């Protein structure tokens, strides 16, 4: 309702604000928020923009321009008055003759609906519904882009029985419009529909058939934008209603096939999303395959480079990213039967002159080799070599697919005498790694820790040699291959193990690894990579790590410390404090595991100086059943590596144990289990009272049904090893645990946990003799899988199958030793004296 020199002084002040300087710009939009806290300022802005027809386009334009950021941002200290002012002015001149001023009137509902939020603009719908009716094409035109744009942005909600429903007539009323004369009528009509497919809002799907008719009716448009979002509409369809889609499939891939050669590159994009979206469903195999011969093609002839991207090189989402997504689930989908589609191609391609063919070829050889890999096999003799020698191609895309390639047939290589295919491929790639074309190093060093992963122990010969350019890759990898090296040095301490404990190669590897380790901030968005390759170079080296733990251990404790002061404010703090990434802990309690499991008795001088068990009982009882599980872990680890900083905490961490003894967490109550067994041969005797709170729910998780072996395992093991210090606890329970004790480990190999776990059982069968005497059939099938029991265990067995056949004599036990297995009877005879 304003004037006059107020109006005059914010003319001048949009005048200003065009400016051809930037220094008088970028200080007069100062000026611009100055009285933006004044809310009668946007009275003067809606006017220039819809009344003040005496100014240019470009100044009024702007006026609703700055209008539109001043929504976008203290609009909750917008007073009603004014808002219905502007609303009103903005739905009044919707269809401006002028385009400009018509198109900021747009932007302005638009922003005005998606901040309204939105019950907040109860008229809006119904009347540009109205407005759809309207005569006039401006009116028409605009109303259906603004609400277009309020389907794309409020699909949800309005979906959503929050403003109640308005589509439920907005639907039908948009159907209706598909038949409209205009181009691009036609097409907001439907790209409004498409938002409510996936979302299977009821409003259309009781309309699917009116719809796709309408659909199918608007397939030949010449006009690009409808025929791209028909595609989208019948990809999208796809997902959600394959049952009226059905008996059309042959027509509709048929429109497709066609479509994705189309000449516009957004209908191509958005057909092509067809091919990936139906390799999905299981009602395909039995439908494309006479199509095959003609998609097959056109697929492989979209996987070539773009001219943009030629040029972009030497985008997320390309024809030929999707193109070969595609081709990818389809080698998935029909296996080696696909072959006879795409290998005559290849021959052409892999040896064309032209690189971007040769390439796009290349690219197919990868694409395919998930699902076609067993047919690939008798062409792999001569492709692999190929490729191998593709890697010195002077295009530099040439050289990174191949990589990538080479990388996707690395079973297969190892598979073979590794001179003949690995060793080449080996120096070849690692070549690569130092190329001077980043993408090429990102690609080399990605295939070469993929190469690694199926390598393991097959590298150990060439370590000095990857070492030696991994290295060096440090002084030459930007950041985001640098990450890629982290990897690629993880997995090699992964696949050699305690092969690479060599003081030589720590000398290399160890000093630019803690130099970047040192420039890392607790903030940095670098460690999350680094701790998981520290963590695995860790485990590898075991004690020879020694002198470089200092100061992993002490950041990773700072962590699990960081993350649960984080958590407790979080607590109360939902509105101030941010809720921690828990996966950070995990880690850091799993680096700590490692750093105890491969350092032993070292790290009790860094245990003791830290709260590292303070924090370990309060990650026993985190809500989240990953946090227990790894912290467990990182407590038998510190029970068996250094006891002595442990025990004065074996009265609080026992009960957690006990109440943490539940199965339906499998790798949490493995881990509690395996704590506790280790914690009982560390405690001795003392562990006497704690044995009754957690061997009641043992007993009953080893007589339990469907239980993963190695839980089933560990228990049998834990049980033991209670029964071996506090024998009168655990021995008078034999008769209701044997059965399964012995099921369970007599398929464990016989090492440390097993002999633990007998010497055990032994004890409680000196003390309780009564138990085993009943099921003593399976104790017989238990001691008689060991290959390589100790001396004095040796003993423990002859003691017990000698002294209770004596106690049912020489005629009972011939009876009682027939049901044996002629490896297990002549084992017994032949190892104890029957």
């Given at each position: 309702?304003?004037?006059?020199?107020?109006?005059?002084q914010?003319?001048?002040?949009?005048?200003?604000?065009?400016?051809?300087?930037?220094?008088?710009?970028?200080?007069?939009?100062?000026?611009?928020?100055?009285?933006?806290?004044?809310?009668?300022?946007?009275?003067?802005?809606?006017?220039?923009?819809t009344?003040?027809?005496?100014?240019?386009e470009?100044?009024?334009?702007?006026?609703?321009?700055?209008?539109?950021?001043?929504?976008?941002?203290?609009?909750?200290?917008?007073?009603?008055?004014?808002?219905?002012?502007?609303?009103?002015?903005?739905?009044?001149?919707?269809?401006?003759?002028?385009?400009?001023?018509?198109?900021?009137?747009?932007?302005?509902?638009?922003?005005?609906?998606?901040?309204?939020?939105?019950?907040?603009?109860?008229?809006?719908?119904?009347?540009?519904?109205?407005?759809?009716?309207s005569e006039?094409?401006?009116?028409?035109?605009?109303?259906?882009?603004?609400?277009?744009?309020?389907?794309?942005?409020?699909?949800?909600?309005?979906d959503?029985?929050?403003?109640?429903?308005?589509?439920?007539?907005?639907?039908?009323?948009?159907?209706?419009?598909?038949?409209?004369?205009?181009?691009?009528?036609?097409?907001?009509?439907?790209?409004?529909?498409?938002?409510?497919?996936?979302?299977?809002t009821?409003?259309?799907?009781?309309?699917?058939?009116?719809?796709?008719?309408?659909?199918?009716?608007?397939?030949?448009?010449?006009?690009?934008?409808?025929?791209?979002?028909?595609?989208?509409?019948?990809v999208?369809?796809?997902?959600v209603?394959?049952?009226?889609?059905?008996?059309?499939?042959?027509?509709?891939?048929?429109?497709?096939?066609?479509?994705?050669?189309?000449?516009?590159?957004?209908v191509?994009?958005?057909?092509?999303?067809?091919?990936?979206?139906?390799?999905?469903?299981?009602?395909?195999k039995?439908?494309?395959?006479?199509?095959?011969?003609?998609?097959?093609?056109?697929?492989?002839?979209?996987?070539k480079?773009?001219?943009?991207?030629?040029?972009l090189?030497?985008?997320?989402?390309?024809?030929?990213?999707?193109?070969?997504?595609?081709?990818?689930?389809l080698?998935?989908?029909?296996?080696?039967?696909?072959?006879?589609?795409?290998?005559?191609?290849?021959?052409?391609?892999?040896?064309?002159?032209?690189?971007?063919?040769?390439?796009?070829?290349?690219?197919?050889?990868?694409?395919?080799?998930?699902?076609?890999?067993?047919?690939?096999?008798?062409?792999?003799?001569?492709?692999?070599?190929?490729?191998?020698?593709?890697?010195?191609?002077?295009?530099?895309?040439?050289?990174?697919?191949?990589?990538?390639?080479?990388?996707?047939?690395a079973?297969?290589?190892?598979?073979?005498?590794?001179?003949?295919?690995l060793k080449?491929?080996?120096?070849?790639?690692?070549?690569?790694?130092?190329?001077?074309?980043?993408?090429?190093?990102?690609?080399?060093?990605?295939?070469?820790?993929?190469?690694?992963?199926?390598?393991?122990?097959?590298?150990?010969?060439?370590?000095?040699?990857?070492?030696?350019?991994?290295?060096?890759?440090?002084?030459?990898y930007?950041?985001?291959?640098?990450?890629?090296?982290?990897?690629?040095?993880?997995?090699?301490?992964?696949?050699?193990?305690?092969?690479?404990?060599?003081?030589?190669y720590?000398q290399?590897?160890?000093?630019?690894?803690?130099?970047?380790?040192?420039?890392?901030?607790?903030?940095?968005?670098?460690?999350f990579?680094?701790?998981?390759?520290?963590?695995?170079?860790?485990?590898?080296?075991?004690?020879?790590?020694?002198?470089?733990?200092?100061?992993?251990?002490?950041?990773?404790?700072?962590?699990?410390?960081?993350?649960?002061?984080?958590?407790?404010?979080?607590?109360?703090?939902?509105?101030?404090?941010?809720?921690?990434?828990?996966?950070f802990?995990?880690?850091?309690?799993?680096l700590?595991?490692?750093?105890?499991?491969?350092?032993?008795?070292?790290?009790?001088?860094?245990?003791?100086?830290?709260?590292?068990?303070?924090?370990?009982?309060?990650?026993?009882?985190?809500?989240?059943?990953?946090?227990?599980?790894?912290?467990?872990?990182?407590?038998?680890?510190?029970?068996?590596?250094?006891?002595?900083?442990?025990?004065?905490?074996?009265?609080?961490?026992?009960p957690?144990?006990?109440?943490n003894?539940?199965?339906?967490?499998?790798?949490?109550?493995?881990?509690?289990?395996?704590?506790?067994?280790?914690?009982?041969?560390?405690?001795?005797?003392?562990?006497?009272?704690?044995?009754?709170?957690?061997?009641?729910?043992?007993?009953?998780?080893?007589?339990?049904?469907?239980?993963?072996?190695?839980?089933?395992?560990?228990?049998?093991?834990?049980?033991?090893?209670?029964?071996?210090?506090?024998?009168?606890?655990?021995?008078?329970?034999?008769?209701?645990?044997?059965?399964?004790?012995?099921?369970?480990?007599?398929?464990?190999?016989?090492?440390?946990?097993?002999?633990?776990?007998?010497?055990?059982?032994?004890?409680?069968?000196?003390?309780?003799?009564?138990?085993?005497?009943?099921?003593?059939?399976?104790?017989?099938?238990?001691?008689?899988?060991?290959?390589?029991?100790?001396?004095?265990?040796?003993?423990?067995?002859?003691?017990?199958?000698?002294?209770?056949?004596?106690?049912?004599?020489?005629?009972?036990?011939?009876?009682?030793?027939?049901?044996?297995?002629?490896?297990?009877?002549?084992?017994?005879?032949?190892?104890?004296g029957?």
């Amino acid at each position: 309702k304003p004037d006059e020199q107020g109006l005059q002084q914010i003319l001048q002040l949009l005048k200003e604000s065009q400016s051809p300087d930037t220094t008088i710009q970028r200080t007069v939009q100062q000026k611009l928020e100055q009285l933006n806290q004044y809310p009668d300022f946007n009275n003067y802005l809606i006017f220039v923009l819809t009344k003040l027809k005496s100014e240019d386009e470009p100044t009024r334009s702007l006026s609703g321009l700055i209008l539109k950021n001043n929504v976008k941002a203290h609009f909750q200290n917008f007073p009603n008055g004014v808002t219905d002012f502007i609303k009103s002015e903005c739905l009044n001149n919707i269809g401006d003759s002028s385009p400009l001023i018509r198109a900021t009137v747009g932007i302005l509902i638009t922003t005005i609906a998606s901040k309204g939020e939105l019950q907040n603009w109860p008229d809006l719908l119904p009347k540009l519904c109205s407005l759809l009716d309207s005569e006039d094409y401006n009116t028409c035109e605009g109303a259906f882009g603004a609400l277009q744009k309020i389907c794309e942005d409020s699909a949800e909600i309005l979906d959503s029985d929050v403003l109640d429903r308005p589509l439920n007539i907005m639907i039908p009323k948009f159907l209706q419009f598909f038949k409209h004369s205009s181009p691009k009528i036609r097409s907001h009509a439907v790209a409004c529909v498409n938002q409510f497919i996936i979302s299977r809002t009821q409003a259309l799907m009781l309309h699917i058939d009116s719809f796709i008719e309408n659909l199918f009716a608007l397939a030949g448009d010449e006009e690009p934008e409808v025929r791209k979002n028909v595609c989208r509409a019948l990809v999208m369809l796809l997902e959600v209603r394959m049952d009226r889609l059905l008996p059309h499939m042959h027509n509709i891939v048929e429109y497709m096939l066609q479509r994705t050669q189309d000449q516009d590159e957004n209908v191509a994009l958005e057909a092509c999303e067809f091919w990936l979206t139906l390799a999905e469903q299981p009602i395909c195999k039995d439908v494309l395959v006479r199509h095959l011969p003609k998609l097959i093609p056109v697929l492989v002839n979209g996987m070539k480079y773009s001219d943009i991207d030629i040029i972009l090189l030497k985008s997320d989402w390309n024809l030929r990213k999707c193109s070969a997504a595609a081709l990818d689930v389809l080698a998935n989908v029909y296996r080696d039967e696909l072959l006879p589609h795409i290998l005559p191609l290849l021959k052409e391609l892999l040896f064309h002159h032209e690189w971007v063919v040769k390439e796009s070829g290349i690219l197919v050889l990868g694409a395919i080799a998930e699902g076609c890999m067993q047919g690939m096999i008798p062409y792999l003799p001569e492709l692999i070599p190929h490729l191998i020698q593709c890697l010195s191609d002077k295009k530099a895309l040439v050289r990174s697919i191949t990589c990538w390639t080479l990388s996707r047939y690395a079973h297969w290589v190892v598979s073979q005498p590794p001179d003949t295919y690995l060793k080449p491929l080996m120096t070849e790639l690692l070549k690569r790694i130092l190329d001077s074309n980043k993408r090429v190093q990102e690609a080399a060093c990605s295939a070469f820790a993929t190469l690694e992963e199926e390598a393991c122990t097959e590298l150990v010969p060439y370590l000095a040699y990857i070492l030696d350019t991994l290295v060096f890759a440090f002084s030459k990898y930007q950041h985001k291959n640098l990450l890629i090296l982290y990897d690629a040095i993880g997995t090699l301490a992964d696949s050699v193990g305690h092969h690479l404990n060599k003081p030589e190669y720590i000398q290399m590897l160890m000093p630019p690894l803690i130099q970047k380790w040192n420039m890392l901030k607790d903030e940095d968005k670098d460690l999350f990579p680094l701790l998981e390759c520290l963590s695995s170079v860790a485990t590898a080296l075991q004690s020879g790590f020694l002198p470089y733990c200092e100061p992993v251990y002490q950041r990773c404790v700072n962590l699990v410390q960081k993350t649960l002061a984080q958590a407790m404010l979080n607590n109360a703090q939902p509105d101030q404090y941010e809720a921690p990434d828990k996966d950070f802990m995990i880690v850091a309690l799993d680096l700590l595991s490692g750093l105890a499991e491969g350092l032993g008795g070292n790290i009790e001088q860094l245990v003791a100086r830290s709260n590292i068990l303070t924090l370990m009982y309060q990650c026993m009882q985190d809500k989240m059943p990953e946090v227990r599980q790894s912290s467990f872990a990182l407590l038998g680890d510190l029970t068996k590596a250094c006891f002595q900083h442990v025990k004065p905490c074996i009265a609080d961490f026992m009960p957690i144990l006990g109440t943490n003894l539940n199965p339906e967490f499998i790798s949490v109550c493995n881990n509690a289990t395996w704590a506790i067994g280790e914690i009982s041969i560390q405690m001795g005797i003392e562990m006497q009272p704690y044995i009754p709170m957690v061997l009641h729910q043992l007993v009953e998780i080893i007589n339990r049904p469907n239980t993963p072996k190695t839980l089933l395992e560990n228990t049998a093991i834990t049980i033991g090893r209670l029964g071996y210090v506090c024998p009168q606890e655990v021995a008078p329970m034999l008769q209701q645990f044997i059965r399964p004790w012995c099921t369970s480990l007599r398929n464990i190999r016989d090492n440390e946990e097993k002999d633990s776990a007998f010497r055990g059982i032994c004890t409680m069968i000196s003390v309780n003799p009564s138990g085993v005497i009943q099921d003593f059939i399976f104790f017989c099938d238990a001691v008689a899988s060991w290959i390589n029991p100790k001396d004095d265990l040796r003993d423990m067995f002859c003691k017990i199958l000698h002294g209770f056949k004596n106690q049912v004599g020489d005629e009972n036990w011939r009876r009682f030793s027939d049901q044996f297995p002629l490896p297990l009877k002549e084992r017994l005879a032949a190892f104890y004296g029957v």
